[PDB]
From a paper:
Examples include herpesviruses and most bacteriophages, both of which replicate their DNA as head-to-tail concatemers containing multiple copies of the genome that must be cleaved to generate unit-length viral genomes. This is achieved using a “terminase” complex, which, in bacteriophages comprises two proteins, termed Large (TerL) and Small (TerS) terminases; but in herpesviruses contains three separate components—pUL15, pUL28 and pUL33—in hitherto unknown oligomeric forms. The terminase complex recognizes a specific sequence or structure on the concatemeric DNA and cuts it to produce the free end where packaging is initiated. Acting as the packaging motor, the terminase complex then hydrolyzes ATP molecules to translocate negatively charged DNA into a space-limited procapsid through a dodecameric portal. Each subunit of the hexameric ring is a heterotrimer formed by three proteins (pUL15, pUL28 and pUL33) interdigitating with each other.
After a unit length genome is translocated, the terminase utilizes its nuclease domain to initiate a second site-specific cleavage step, leading to the dissociation of the DNA concatemer from the filled capsid and the start of the DNA packaging into another procapsid. However, the nuclease domains are distal from the central channel (~45 Å from the exterior of the channel) and the catalytically active residues are oriented towards the sides of the channel in the hexameric ring, which suggests that head-full sensing relayed to the terminase complex through the portal would reorient the nuclease domain to be proximal to the central channel for DNA cleavage. The regulator linking the ATPase and nuclease domains might be involved in this re-arrangement of the nuclease domain. Notably, the two regulator domains, one from pUL15 and the other from pUL28, are positioned on the two sides of the ATPase and nuclease domains, as if to act as hinges to regulate conformational changes of the nuclease.
Numbering used by the authors: 476 to 693, 703 to 728
């Protein structure tokens, strides 16, 4: 009973443009992912959310509820074609617009996969722009979120979701029923059908939030929602993420 329907008419309604108003953006680009490694489950998709900043508010570029296909031996790489296949589409319609992006991968499933997952992300990102697109000779310049496991001093490029979920939700609903965030007119999708609305598909899933401690997800398929909210909590300030 959380996100107001007055905001939902607004957040569904207004379609601002980042093709023209790009110069009024922060040149950085947070992006989150939520890998779920099982298949054939209505909440086991993998979320994509990529967000930028205006002066004080936040703005959405692409959402992919990435299911797992059947018969997967190369499954982390497929997730890597998802998220990089998104970032290339954002950077594509935004020529010379962004300085550097920051990919976030959660490791609540395991710390083991996300290392080679983000490594395989930097692999294909490091592949693509040198092939074609434009002459951005290391233009959009990737960095990652490098975290520390509890009890291990070695920094790996991942993100724990331990203490952060409640201030992230409180930040998101702090902004969202105030009409802070918005979704771009040129919001990008690959997995969701170009016929159907992406923003409608988000807003259905946004409508399953819960109380002051927020034990959420009544339901199914929170991954887009949880993805957007961790993405926007990193769209504000926190500890520094860095280069790989």
């Amino acid at each position: 009973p959380v996100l107001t329907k007055s905001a939902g008419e607004r957040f569904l309604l207004y379609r601002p443009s980042t093709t023209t108003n790009s110069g009024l953006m922060a040149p950085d680009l947070y992006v989150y992912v939520d890998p779920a490694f099982t298949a054939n489950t209505r909440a086991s998709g993998t979320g994509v959310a990529v967000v930028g900043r205006y002066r004080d508010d936040y703005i959405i570029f692409a959402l992919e509820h990435f299911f797992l296909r059947a018969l997967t031996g190369s499954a982390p790489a497929d997730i890597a074609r998802c998220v990089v296949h998104s970032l290339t589409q954002v950077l594509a319609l935004h020529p010379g617009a962004f300085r550097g992006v920051r990919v976030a991968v959660e490791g609540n499933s395991s710390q083991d996969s996300a290392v080679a997952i983000a490594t395989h992300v930097h692999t294909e990102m490091h592949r693509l722009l040198a092939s074609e697109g434009a002459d951005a000779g290391s233009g959009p310049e990737l960095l990652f979120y490098h975290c520390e496991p509890p009890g291990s001093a070695v920094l790996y490029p991942f993100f724990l979701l331990n203490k952060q979920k409640t201030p992230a939700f409180e930040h998101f609903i702090k902004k969202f029923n105030s009409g802070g965030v918005m979704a771009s007119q040129e919001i990008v999708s690959a997995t969701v059908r170009l016929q159907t609305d992406p923003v409608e598909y988000l807003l259905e899933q946004l409508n399953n939030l819960t109380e002051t401690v927020s034990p959420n997800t009544d339901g199914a398929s929170d991954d887009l929602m949880v993805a957007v909210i961790m993405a926007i909590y990193l769209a504000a300030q926190a500890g520094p993420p860095h280069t790989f």
